[PDB]
């Protein structure tokens, strides 16, 4: 069943783990002038569920320069009271000989004509380590997945 912290929320994604033994439901609200995201993390073997945050994020596999194994990154973007920030991070223990990936943050810019605007979708190219971000207005930005350095931003919609 849908956990009440979600009630009235824009459902925007549904995700499981590989075993389907955990389930994630997400949705966002326009709560008091910000895009607040709600998540439901359901345990299927425990039969217990909890509430959590947010909105445009995806996971990659990236081989860092001198390692043999592909670090599992979790890249997510939000606009908060501090303004819009993208985070890339390792998730879980590095495969054994791997030198850990430094966590990253960068700010995502929203113009003054971008008055409300916030993140909405993310996709990463594995072919070219790049983070594609789409906002609510129809703005795009690409960031370098390893070093979150901005590489372009423009309106396409």
């Amino acid at each position: 069943d849908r956990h009440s912290s979600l009630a009235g929320c824009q459902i925007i994604n549904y995700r499981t783990d590989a075993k389907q033994k955990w389930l994630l439901l997400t949705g966002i609200s326009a709560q008091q002038n910000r895009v607040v995201g709600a998540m439901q993390l359901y345990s299927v073997d425990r039969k217990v569920s909890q509430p959590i945050e947010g909105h445009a994020a995806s996971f990659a596999q990236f081989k860092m320069e001198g390692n043999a194994e592909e670090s599992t990154l979790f890249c997510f973007a939000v606009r908060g009271q501090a303004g819009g920030k993208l985070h890339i991070i390792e998730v879980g223990t590095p495969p054994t000989g791997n030198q850990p990936f430094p966590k990253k943050a960068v700010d995502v810019f929203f113009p003054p004509e971008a008055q409300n605007d916030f993140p909405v979708a993310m996709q990463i190219s594995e072919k070219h380590d790049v983070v594609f971000l789409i906002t609510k207005y129809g703005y795009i930005h690409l960031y370098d997945l390893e070093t979150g350095t901005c590489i372009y931003m423009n309106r396409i919609s």
């Binding site: 075993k19 033994k21 955990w22 345990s43 073997d45 425990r46 991070i89 390792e90 879980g92 223990t93 590095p94 054994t96 030198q99 850990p100 430094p102 966590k103």
Partner: protein, 233 residues
């Protein structure tokens, strides 16, 4: 008290931007602890400490936030007892007792793994009735029986039984057969899995045969390892 391993280096300073973690596990009166020492070998203060585990075979999690309240100054070294329980999400790891960890502070997130010694998962109520022991050993498929060798042991059966008792491995019965001591023993994991054991102690033989029956025989290898460590320490 049961066997506790010496602390070992889990995260070296040079891998973790000057953070050094050493650790062991303990069981104190029905309570599991991850016992660590954190040392700041960096030139910055360290703050904002936090920890999590990946999903694991015995559903092991911290039961509270990590109790580091004050900045860990350069050169400083603190002893941290983190309480654990087994209520957390289960995913079967390889090895079965491996635990993946992430530790954060104000500089970065770091990761490491360590191996949980299974005797901290041996529960207080792990003594089987003799009746039930015989019935359960007989109910468990004989293909599940696994044999192991405790090499170079010279403890008497009494001393084996008292040391194992202190680790919640209970002796149910003892059989003298022609100078051989047979010890029949039960233990129970935090997940409710029972393990039954026959130790065989023979005159002249520096090696004891440990025979283990379990419904989940994959675990038996790890019981033997800590059984061996308890006898040898």
């Amino acid at each position: 008290g049961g066997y506790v391993a010496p602390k070992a280096v889990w995260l070296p300073a040079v891998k973790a931007k000057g953070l050094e973690i050493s650790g062991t596990f303990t069981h104190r009166q029905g309570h599991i602890y991850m016992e660590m020492n954190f040392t700041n070998k960096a030139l910055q203060h360290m703050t904002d400490f936090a920890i999590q585990f990946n999903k694991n075979s015995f559903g092991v999690i911290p039961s509270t936030p990590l109790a580091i309240h004050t900045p860990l100054m350069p050169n400083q070294s603190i002893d941290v007892s983190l309480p654990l329980n087994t209520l957390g999400p289960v995913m079967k790891m390889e090895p079965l007792n491996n635990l993946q960890v992430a530790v954060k502070n104000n500089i970065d997130v770091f990761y490491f793994s360590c191996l949980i010694p299974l005797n901290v998962l041996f529960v207080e109520d792990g003594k089987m009735e003799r009746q039930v022991f015989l019935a359960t050993w007989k109910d468990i498929p004989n293909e599940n029986e696994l044999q192991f060798q405790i090499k170079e042991c010279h403890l008497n059966a009494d001393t084996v039984s008292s040391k194992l008792q202190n680790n919640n491995v209970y002796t149910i019965a003892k059989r003298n057969v022609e100078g051989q001591d047979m010890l029949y023993q039960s233990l129970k994991l935090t997940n409710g899995i029972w393990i039954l054991a026959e130790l065989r102690i023979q005159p002249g033989n520096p090696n004891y045969t440990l025979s283990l029956k379990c419904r989940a025989p994959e675990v038996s290898q790890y019981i033997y390892q800590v059984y061996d460590s308890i006898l040898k320490n």
